[PDB]
């Protein structure tokens, strides 16, 4: 997701 690398 944002701001999530997964």
Q: How far apart are CA 4 and CA 6, in angstroms?
A: 5
DSSP symbol at 2:
T
Residue 1 structure tokens: 């997701």
DSSP class per residue in 1-6 = -TT---
For tokens 């690398």, what's the residue? 5
For tokens 């997964």, what's the residue? 6
Residue 5 structure tokens: 């690398």
Name residues whose C-beta falls within 8 Å of residue 2's C-beta, 6 or more positions apart in sequence: none
CB atoms within 10 A of CB 3: 4
Say which experimental method was used. Answer: NMR
For tokens 């999530």, what's the residue? 4
């Amino acid at each position: 997701a944002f701001p999530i690398p997964x």
